[PDB]
């Protein structure tokens, strides 16, 4: 990932309610 939305769908789509990825990594805070 090296924005916000390339862990947006890949976590929060995925189960996350949220995954915000910045320069290479992302917090993906589950549901």
């Keep these: 990932c090296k ?5 947006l769908k890949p976590c929060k789509d995925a189960g996350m309610r949220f995954g ?3 320069n290479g990594k992302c917090h993906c805070t589950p549901k």
């Design 3 to 7: 924005i916000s939305r390339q862990c």
């Design 20 to 22: 915000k990825c910045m």
